[PDB]
Amino acid sequence: APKHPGKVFLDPSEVADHLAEYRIVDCRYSLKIKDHGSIQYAKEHVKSAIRADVDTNLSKLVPTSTARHPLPPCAEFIDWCMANGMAGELPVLCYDDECGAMGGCRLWWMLNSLGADAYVINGGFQACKAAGLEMESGEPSSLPRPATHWPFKTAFQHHYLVDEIPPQAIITDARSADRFASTVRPYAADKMPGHIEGARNLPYTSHLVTRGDGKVLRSEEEIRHNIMTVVQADLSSFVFSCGSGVTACINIALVHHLGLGHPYLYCGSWSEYSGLFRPPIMRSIIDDYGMCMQMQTPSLGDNPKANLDTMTLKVDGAPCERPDAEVQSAATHLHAGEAATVYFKSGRVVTIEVPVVPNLEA
Numbered sequence: 001a002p003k004h005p006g007k008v009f010l011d012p013s014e015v016a017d018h019l020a021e022y023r024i025v026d027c028r029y030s031l032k033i034k035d036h037g038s039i040q041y042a043k044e045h046v047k048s049a050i051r052a053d054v055d056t057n058l059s060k061l062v063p064t065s066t067a068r069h070p071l072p073p074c075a076e077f078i079d080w081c082m083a084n085g086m087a088g089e090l091p092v093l094c095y096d097d098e099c100g101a102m103g104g105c106r107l108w109w110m111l112n113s114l115g116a117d118a119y120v121i122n123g124g125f126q127a128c129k130a131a132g133l134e135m136e137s138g139e140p141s142s143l144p145r146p147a148t149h150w151p152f153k154t155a156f157q158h159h160y161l162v163d164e165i166p167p168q169a170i171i172t173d174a175r176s177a178d179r180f181a182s183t184v185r186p187y188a189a190d191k192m193p194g195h196i197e198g199a200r201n202l203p204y205t206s207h208l209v210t211r212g213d214g215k216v217l218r219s220e221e222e223i224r225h226n227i228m229t230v231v232q233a234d235l236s237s238f239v240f241s242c243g244s245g246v247t248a249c250i251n252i253a254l255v256h257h258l259g260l261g262h263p264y265l266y267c268g269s270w271s272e273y274s275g276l277f278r279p280p281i282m283r284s285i286i287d288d289y290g291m292c293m294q295m296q297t298p299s300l301g302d303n304p305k306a307n308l309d310t311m312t313l314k315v316d317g318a319p320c321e322r323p324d325a326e327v328q329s330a331a332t333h334l335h336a337g338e339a340a341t342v343y344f345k346s347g348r349v350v351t352i353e354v355p356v357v358p359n360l361e362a
């Protein structure tokens, strides 16, 4: 059945003169840039490629869930697949602009869980431009081609919803080490510091090297060495997760590709988990570290750290030249421009805001 048995990744070199043989899907997405990928798939895209929207096609936000990219209802996703000719006449070839980690492997995961044939391009769109692949622009007004029969499974396979995760399942976490190892305050998109207890961190960036102006995969032995840091040969029963179930898909993909098995996905991931179990999570943080923070702004980990020699903080909404020792302690964890509500083990609650730039007279 499958075009490339055992594979999920493919270099441009393996596909460049065999393009027509795939249904190509542009899964470009950015966590921060508004309408990215729809803006970028217009400027330029691989010829004959249609586009998948991480937010609206590959997931469906629910009001009753903090999950950031939960699986969409399967019937809705399959409907969308058929409408776009992704129903098994050709194998799907997915790409994004972070080597599969940021949209591509997610689509791959979904198609594969249904029993369909799909692959991801090593190196993404950048390694498509930089390999001389045929390009097109704007909205193509030619050939989608709807399918009317569905030969594949009807429900996504080999994934656990939160309550289905066995109590002592081995869980990995694809998020950056900074996020994983966060104590009293979160970074990037996370609302809660920490991770699922017992989880093993396998930062997905570890498998990637920035050849050109985009990441490509590190070598196979390098990726195998990466994967081995969370083992201790068949990881099919591990539960792979991240912040919202997107980056975890490359960890599952690389494991699959290298022949090491096919781990469960926990799609809801930390965004879901930390929302559902917010109370006990906050109590352990307060217990372990003396305080827990809830951000009132986006996190600004790349901004300058708060420095009380050059800055006066706004505490509970007023400039505060006399910050007591607790506030001063909390502020060592904050950055220029951030605001956070801090819950101290004492029962004390304070809001602290750091000025965007040094603001002390002297």
Ligand SMILES: O=S([O-])[O-]
Pocket (backbone or CB within 6 Å): 031, 068, 175, 189, 242, 243, 244, 245, 246, 247
């Ligand atoms: O994609 S982030 O939310 O893990």
Ligand SMILES: [Ca+2]
Pocket (backbone or CB within 6 Å): 288
């Ligand atoms: Ca501890």
